[PDB]
From Swiss-Prot:
Lineage of the species this protein comes from: Archaea, Methanobacteriati, Methanobacteriota, Stenosarchaea group, Methanomicrobia
Residues annotated as binding methylcob(III)alamin: H102
Protein name (database record): Monomethylamine corrinoid protein 1
Organism, scientific name: Methanosarcina barkeri
Domain B12-binding: residue ranges: 89-212
Gene3D superfamilies: Cobalamin-binding domain, Methionine synthase domain
Gene giving rise to this polypeptide: mtmC1
Record-linked NCBIfam families: pyl_corrinoid
Cysteines engaged in disulfide bonds, as pairs: none
Keyword Chloroplast: no
Amino acid sequence: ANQEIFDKLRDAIVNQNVAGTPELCKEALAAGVPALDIITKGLSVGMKIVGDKFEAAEIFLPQIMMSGKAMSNAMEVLTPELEKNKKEAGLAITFVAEGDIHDIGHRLVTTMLGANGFQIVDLGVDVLNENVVEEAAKHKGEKVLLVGSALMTTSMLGQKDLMDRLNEEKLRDSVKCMFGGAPVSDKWIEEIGADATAENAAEAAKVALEVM
Ligand SMILES: [Mg+2]
């Protein structure tokens, strides 16, 4: 059910309706629809279409910026809804690779983690690999999970360096590492030496738990 409001949410993103997206999130929300379904069956569906349109040179950067802001505004209404049911499996240090400012997915995963029994340490975006290493050092010995984002190949490559720097500082084996984004493949995860990855907030939370 709810297909109509899903399409409206999907279209609000596709048509750069920044002001409207929030209203619809409330409309759907008030209709007893779960925040995560609003994202995965509506907003995310639209963001994907907008992604294809761009890669096909149909739309451009002015449209992508507005679709981005459209979803960020939507997240301001759903995040609090997601932080409910705060079901401490450990400490998660979240960040987006250096030179990368894409934070929608990063913010979504960080919200789920924590909502699923995790203490959060959000480093923000454009985080240097050393500041992540410095953060991991301050928490050496305890239950630590490094959650990293990167939506650009150029920034995703730096994840290798990160893993390499964690070893040079013999800090690795004491922490679990999960990278994500999209340019991140199940191949690249082992090429460097990570412990996992997810494709969405939902799975991210599950994998985070399983990886103990
Ligand atoms: Mg810089």
